[PDB]
PDB file of C-alpha atoms and ligand atoms in Angstrom:
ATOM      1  CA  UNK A   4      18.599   2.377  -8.567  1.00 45.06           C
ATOM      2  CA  UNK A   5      15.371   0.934  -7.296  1.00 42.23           C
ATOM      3  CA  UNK A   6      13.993  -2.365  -8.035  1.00 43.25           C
ATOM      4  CA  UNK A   7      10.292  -2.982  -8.525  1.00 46.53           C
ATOM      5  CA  UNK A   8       9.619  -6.292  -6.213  1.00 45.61           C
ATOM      6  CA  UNK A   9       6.048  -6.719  -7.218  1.00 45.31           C
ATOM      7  CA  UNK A  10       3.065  -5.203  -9.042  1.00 46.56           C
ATOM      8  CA  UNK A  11      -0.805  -5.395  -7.487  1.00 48.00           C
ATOM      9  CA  UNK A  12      -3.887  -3.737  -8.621  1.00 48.59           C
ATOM     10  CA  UNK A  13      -5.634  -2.279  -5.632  1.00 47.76           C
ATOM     11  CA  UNK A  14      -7.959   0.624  -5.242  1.00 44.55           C
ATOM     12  CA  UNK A  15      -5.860   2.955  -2.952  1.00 42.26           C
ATOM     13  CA  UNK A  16      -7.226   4.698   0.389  1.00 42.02           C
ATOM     14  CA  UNK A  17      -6.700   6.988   3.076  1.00 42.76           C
ATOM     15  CA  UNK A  18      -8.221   7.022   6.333  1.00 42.38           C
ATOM     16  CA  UNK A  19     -10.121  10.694   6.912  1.00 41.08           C
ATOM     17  CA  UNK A  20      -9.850  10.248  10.994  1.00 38.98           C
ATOM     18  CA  UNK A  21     -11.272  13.463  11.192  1.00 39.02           C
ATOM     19  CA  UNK A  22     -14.617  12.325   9.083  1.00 35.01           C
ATOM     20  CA  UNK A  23     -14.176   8.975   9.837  1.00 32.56           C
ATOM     21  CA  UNK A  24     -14.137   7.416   6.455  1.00 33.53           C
ATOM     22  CA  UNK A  25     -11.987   5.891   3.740  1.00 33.21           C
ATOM     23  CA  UNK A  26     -11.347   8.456   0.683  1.00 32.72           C
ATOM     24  CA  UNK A  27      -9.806   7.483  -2.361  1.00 34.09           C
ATOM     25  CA  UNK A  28      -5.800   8.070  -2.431  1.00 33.74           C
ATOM     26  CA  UNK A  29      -4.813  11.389  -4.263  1.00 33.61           C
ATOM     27  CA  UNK A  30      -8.320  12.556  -4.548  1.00 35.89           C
ATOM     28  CA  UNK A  31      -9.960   9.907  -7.028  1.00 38.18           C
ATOM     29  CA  UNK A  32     -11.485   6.678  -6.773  1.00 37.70           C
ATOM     30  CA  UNK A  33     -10.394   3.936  -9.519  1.00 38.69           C
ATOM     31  CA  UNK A  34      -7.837   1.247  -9.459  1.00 40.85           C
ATOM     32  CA  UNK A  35      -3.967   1.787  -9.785  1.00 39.53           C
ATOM     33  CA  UNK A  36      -0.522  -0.480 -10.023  1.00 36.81           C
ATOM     34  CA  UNK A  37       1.304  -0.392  -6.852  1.00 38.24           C
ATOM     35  CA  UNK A  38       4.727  -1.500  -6.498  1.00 37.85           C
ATOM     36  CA  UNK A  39       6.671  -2.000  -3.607  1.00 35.26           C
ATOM     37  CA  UNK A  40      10.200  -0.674  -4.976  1.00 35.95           C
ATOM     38  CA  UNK A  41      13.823  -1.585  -3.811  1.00 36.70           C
ATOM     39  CA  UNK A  42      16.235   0.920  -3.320  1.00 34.79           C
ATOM     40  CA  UNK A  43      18.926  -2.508  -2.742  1.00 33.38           C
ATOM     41  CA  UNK A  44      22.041   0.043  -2.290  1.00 30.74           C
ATOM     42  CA  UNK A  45      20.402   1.285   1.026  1.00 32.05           C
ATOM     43  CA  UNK A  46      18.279  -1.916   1.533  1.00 34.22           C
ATOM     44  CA  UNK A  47      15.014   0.555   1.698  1.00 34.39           C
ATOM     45  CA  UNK A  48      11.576   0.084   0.243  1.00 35.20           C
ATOM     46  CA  UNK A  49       8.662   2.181  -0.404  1.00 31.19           C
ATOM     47  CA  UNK A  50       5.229   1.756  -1.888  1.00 29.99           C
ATOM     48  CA  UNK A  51       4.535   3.537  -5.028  1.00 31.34           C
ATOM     49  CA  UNK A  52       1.192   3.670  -6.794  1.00 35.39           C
ATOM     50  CA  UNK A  53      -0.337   4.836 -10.088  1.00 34.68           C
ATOM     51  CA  UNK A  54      -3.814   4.952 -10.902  1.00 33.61           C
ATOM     52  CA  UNK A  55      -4.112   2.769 -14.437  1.00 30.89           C
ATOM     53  CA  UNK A  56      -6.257   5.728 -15.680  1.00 29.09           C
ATOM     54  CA  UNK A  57      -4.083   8.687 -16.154  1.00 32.38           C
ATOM     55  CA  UNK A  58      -0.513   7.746 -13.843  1.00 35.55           C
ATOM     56  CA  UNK A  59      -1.305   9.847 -10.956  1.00 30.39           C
ATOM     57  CA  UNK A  60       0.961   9.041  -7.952  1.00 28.96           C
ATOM     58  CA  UNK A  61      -1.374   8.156  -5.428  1.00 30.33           C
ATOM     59  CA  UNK A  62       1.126   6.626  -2.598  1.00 29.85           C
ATOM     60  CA  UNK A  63       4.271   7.319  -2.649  1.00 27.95           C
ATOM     61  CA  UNK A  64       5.561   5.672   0.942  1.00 28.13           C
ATOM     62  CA  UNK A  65       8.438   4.506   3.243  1.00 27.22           C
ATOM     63  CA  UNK A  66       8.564   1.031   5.119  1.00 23.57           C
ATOM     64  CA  UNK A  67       9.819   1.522   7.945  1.00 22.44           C
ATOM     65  CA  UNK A  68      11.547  -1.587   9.951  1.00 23.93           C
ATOM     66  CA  UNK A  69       9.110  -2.746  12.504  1.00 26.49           C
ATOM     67  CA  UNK A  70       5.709  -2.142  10.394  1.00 27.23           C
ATOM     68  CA  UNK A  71       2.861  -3.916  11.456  1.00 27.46           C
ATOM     69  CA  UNK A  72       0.946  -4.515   8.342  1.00 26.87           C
ATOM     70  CA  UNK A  73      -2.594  -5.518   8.821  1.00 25.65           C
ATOM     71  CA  UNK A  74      -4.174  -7.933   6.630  1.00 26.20           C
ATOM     72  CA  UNK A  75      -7.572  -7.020   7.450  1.00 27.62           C
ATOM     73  CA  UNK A  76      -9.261  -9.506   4.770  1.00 30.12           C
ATOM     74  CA  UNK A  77      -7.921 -11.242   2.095  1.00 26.80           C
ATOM     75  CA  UNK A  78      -8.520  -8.313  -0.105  1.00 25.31           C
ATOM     76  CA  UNK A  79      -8.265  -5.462   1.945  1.00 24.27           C
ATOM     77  CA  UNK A  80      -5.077  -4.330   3.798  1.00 22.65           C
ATOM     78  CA  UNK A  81      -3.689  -1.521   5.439  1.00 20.48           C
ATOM     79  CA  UNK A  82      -0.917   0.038   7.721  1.00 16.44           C
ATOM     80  CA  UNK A  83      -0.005   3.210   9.722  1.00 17.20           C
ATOM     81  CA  UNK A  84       3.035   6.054   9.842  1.00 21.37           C
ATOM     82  CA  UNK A  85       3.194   8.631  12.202  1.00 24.12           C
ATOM     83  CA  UNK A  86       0.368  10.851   9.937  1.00 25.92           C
ATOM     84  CA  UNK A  87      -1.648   9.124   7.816  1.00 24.69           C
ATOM     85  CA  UNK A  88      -3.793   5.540   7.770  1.00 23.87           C
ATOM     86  CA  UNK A  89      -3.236   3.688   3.996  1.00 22.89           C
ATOM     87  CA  UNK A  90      -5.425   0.361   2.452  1.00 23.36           C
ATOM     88  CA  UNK A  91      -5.292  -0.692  -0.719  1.00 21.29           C
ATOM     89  CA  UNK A  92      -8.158  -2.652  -1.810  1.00 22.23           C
ATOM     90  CA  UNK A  93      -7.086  -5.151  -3.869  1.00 21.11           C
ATOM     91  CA  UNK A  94      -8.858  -6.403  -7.180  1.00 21.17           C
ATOM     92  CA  UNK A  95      -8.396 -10.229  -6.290  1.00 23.36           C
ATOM     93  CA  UNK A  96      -7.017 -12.662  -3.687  1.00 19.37           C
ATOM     94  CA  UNK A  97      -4.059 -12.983  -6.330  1.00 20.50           C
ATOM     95  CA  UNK A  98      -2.835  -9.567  -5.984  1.00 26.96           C
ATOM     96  CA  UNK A  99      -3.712  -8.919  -2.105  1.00 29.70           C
ATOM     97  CA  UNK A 100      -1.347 -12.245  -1.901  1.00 28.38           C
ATOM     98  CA  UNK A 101       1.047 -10.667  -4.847  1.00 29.18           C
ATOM     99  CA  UNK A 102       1.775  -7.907  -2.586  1.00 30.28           C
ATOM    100  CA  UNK A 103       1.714  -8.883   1.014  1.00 30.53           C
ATOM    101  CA  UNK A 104       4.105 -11.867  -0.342  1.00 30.38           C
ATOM    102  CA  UNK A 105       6.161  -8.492  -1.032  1.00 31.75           C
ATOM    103  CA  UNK A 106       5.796  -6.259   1.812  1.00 34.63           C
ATOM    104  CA  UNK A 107       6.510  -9.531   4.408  1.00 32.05           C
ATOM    105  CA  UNK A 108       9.709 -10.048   2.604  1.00 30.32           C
ATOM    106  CA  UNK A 109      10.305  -6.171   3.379  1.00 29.34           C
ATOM    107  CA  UNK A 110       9.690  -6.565   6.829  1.00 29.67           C
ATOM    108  CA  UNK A 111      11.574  -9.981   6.953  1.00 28.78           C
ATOM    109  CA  UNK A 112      14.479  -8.260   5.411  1.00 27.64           C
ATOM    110  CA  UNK A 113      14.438  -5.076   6.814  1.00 24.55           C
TER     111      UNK A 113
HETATM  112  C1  8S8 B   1      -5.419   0.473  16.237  1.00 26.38           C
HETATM  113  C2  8S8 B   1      -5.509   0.692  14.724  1.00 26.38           C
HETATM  114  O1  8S8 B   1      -4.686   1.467  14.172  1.00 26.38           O
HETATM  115  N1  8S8 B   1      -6.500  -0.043  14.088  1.00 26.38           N
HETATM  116  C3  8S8 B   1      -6.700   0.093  12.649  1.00 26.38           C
HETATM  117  C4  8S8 B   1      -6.301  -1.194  11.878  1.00 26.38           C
HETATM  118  C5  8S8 B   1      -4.933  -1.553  12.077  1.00 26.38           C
HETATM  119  C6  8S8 B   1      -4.553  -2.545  12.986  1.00 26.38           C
HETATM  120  C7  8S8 B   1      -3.225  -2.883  13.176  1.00 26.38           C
HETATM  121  C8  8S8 B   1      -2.219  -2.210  12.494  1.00 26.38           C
HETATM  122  C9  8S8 B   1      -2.561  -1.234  11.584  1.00 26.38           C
HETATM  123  C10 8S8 B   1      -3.904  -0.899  11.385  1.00 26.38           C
HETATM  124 CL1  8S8 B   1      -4.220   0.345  10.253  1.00 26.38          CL
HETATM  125  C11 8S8 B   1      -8.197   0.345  12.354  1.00 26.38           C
HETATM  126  O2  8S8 B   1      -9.078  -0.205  12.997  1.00 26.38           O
HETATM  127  N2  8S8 B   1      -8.506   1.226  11.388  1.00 26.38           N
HETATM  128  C12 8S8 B   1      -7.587   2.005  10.538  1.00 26.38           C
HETATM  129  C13 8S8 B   1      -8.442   3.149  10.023  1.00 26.38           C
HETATM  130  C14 8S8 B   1      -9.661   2.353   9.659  1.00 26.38           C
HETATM  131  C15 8S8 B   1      -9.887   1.460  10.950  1.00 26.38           C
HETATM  132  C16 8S8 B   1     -10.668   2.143  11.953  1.00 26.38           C
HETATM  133  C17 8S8 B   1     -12.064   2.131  11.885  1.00 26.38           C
HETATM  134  C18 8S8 B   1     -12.709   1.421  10.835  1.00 26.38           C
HETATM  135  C19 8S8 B   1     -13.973   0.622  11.207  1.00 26.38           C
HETATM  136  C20 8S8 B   1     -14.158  -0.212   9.961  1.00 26.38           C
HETATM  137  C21 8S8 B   1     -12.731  -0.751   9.755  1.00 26.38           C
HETATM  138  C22 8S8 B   1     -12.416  -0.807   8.307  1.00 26.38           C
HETATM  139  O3  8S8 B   1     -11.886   0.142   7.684  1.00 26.38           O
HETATM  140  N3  8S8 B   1     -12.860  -1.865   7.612  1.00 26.38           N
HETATM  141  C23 8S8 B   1     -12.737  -1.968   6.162  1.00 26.38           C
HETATM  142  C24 8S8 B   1     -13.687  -1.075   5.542  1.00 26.38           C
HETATM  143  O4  8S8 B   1     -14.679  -0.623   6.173  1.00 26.38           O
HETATM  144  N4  8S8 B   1     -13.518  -0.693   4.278  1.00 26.38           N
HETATM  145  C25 8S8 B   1     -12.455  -1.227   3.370  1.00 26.38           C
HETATM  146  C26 8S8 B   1     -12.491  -2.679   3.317  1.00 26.38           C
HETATM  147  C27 8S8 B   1     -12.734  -3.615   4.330  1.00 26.38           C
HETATM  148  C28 8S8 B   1     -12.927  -3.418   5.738  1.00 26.38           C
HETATM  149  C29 8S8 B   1     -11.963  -4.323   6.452  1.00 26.38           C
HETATM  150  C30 8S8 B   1     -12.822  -0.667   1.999  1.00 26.38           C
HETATM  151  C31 8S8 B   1     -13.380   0.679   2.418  1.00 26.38           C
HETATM  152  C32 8S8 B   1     -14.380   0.269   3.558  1.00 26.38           C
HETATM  153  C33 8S8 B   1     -15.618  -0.263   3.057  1.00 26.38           C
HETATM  154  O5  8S8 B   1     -15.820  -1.494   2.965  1.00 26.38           O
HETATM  155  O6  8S8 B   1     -16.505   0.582   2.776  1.00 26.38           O
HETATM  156  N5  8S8 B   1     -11.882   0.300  10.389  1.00 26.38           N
HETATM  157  C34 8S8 B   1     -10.555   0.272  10.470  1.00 26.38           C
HETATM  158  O7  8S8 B   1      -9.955  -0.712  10.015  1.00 26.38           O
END
């Protein structure tokens, strides 16, 4: 069904816009594995994330067509939908480039 089109280790984030901080993703802070998965009979993807630890799903995501993905810093990256504000704070340069290699392709293909 879907096709995982990379893996990155990042430290996953929500914006609090009421508090006006960054809080970790699913309510605790540690690193996960986030894939950006292929559904290729619809040509849709979404971003999925576990936390290594225990396999919590921290994001769980649609990308829409048009996304602007902001690439902050070479380690820190982040987008928008309609609610929420996501980053994921990568643990190198390797997978910040791993994924956004990814998500362009996404938005190329999209
Ligand atoms: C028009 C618009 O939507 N603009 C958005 C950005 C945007 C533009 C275009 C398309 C989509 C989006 Cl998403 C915006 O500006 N946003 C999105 C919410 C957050 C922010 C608003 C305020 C704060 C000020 C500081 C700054 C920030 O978060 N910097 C990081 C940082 O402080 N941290 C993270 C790492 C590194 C830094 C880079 C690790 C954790 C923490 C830390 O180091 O402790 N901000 C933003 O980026």
């Amino acid at each position: 069904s879907e096709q995982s089109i990379c893996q990155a280790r990042a430290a996953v984030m929500v914006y609090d816009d009421a508090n006006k901080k960054w809080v970790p993703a699913g309510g605790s802070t540690g690193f996960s594995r986030v894939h950006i998965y292929h559904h290729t009979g619809n040509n849709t993807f979404r971003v999925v994330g576990r936390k290594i630890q225990d396999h919590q799903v921290v994001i769980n995501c649609a990308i829409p067509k048009g996304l602007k993905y902001n690439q902050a810093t070479q380690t820190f990256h982040q987008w928008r939908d309609a609610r929420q504000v996501y980053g994921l704070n990568f643990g190198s340069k390797e997978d910040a480039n791993v994924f956004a290699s990814a998500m362009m392709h996404a938005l190329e293909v999209l």
